[PDB]
């Protein structure tokens, strides 16, 4: 019924009202407190700069510092991209500090989007693509991004 990872987010989203991140927002619209409504955006100077990205957030009951779960609502080409749509990042790990805030994650993958991390990547066809082919990379970036570009 009750638990205290329930109650730390709850003190999470007024703080967040305070002074949301600039760039990403993270914080839920009608969804309960479990699904979480958050939109990401291209950093500048990049080919997403101009795109638009939106990502939901997860939750669990388990622990406050428990590895949460996060993965994007549009299906798009990234550099690195788990089987579930998941983000490989070292938060998704045990390596998340209870520190930091729900914003933390969603500076987290912005900056992913600028430039990723060779280090055993999860989607080798497009890592490599990025040091072979820059033209078909570049396509499959403009292409993703128009899907969600424009909706009305």
Same mark, same amino acid.
């Given at each position: 019924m009750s638990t205290p990872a329930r109650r730390r987010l709850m003190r999470d989203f007024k703080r967040l009202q305070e002074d949301p991140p600039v760039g990403v927002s993270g914080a839920p619209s009608? &969804?309960?407190?479990?699904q979480w409504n958050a939109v990401i955006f291209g950093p500048e100077?990049?080919?997403?700069?101009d795109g638009t990205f939106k990502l939901v957030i997860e939750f669990s009951?388990?622990?406050?510092?428990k590895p949460p779960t996060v993965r994007f609502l549009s299906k798009m080409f990234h550099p690195n991209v788990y089987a579930d749509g998941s983000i490989c990042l070292?938060?998704?790990? &045990?390596?998340?500090?209870?520190?930091?805030?729900?914003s933390s994650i969603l500076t987290s993958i912005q900056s992913l989007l600028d430039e990723p991390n060779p280090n055993s990547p999860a989607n080798s066809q497009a890592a490599q693509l990025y040091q072979e082919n820059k033209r078909e990379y570049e396509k499959r970036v403009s292409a993703i991004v128009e899907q969600s570009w424009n909706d009305s």
């Open positions: 009608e &969804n309960n407190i479990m100077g990049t080919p997403f700069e009951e388990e622990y406050p510092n070292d938060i998704l790990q &045990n390596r998340w500090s209870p520190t930091y805030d729900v």
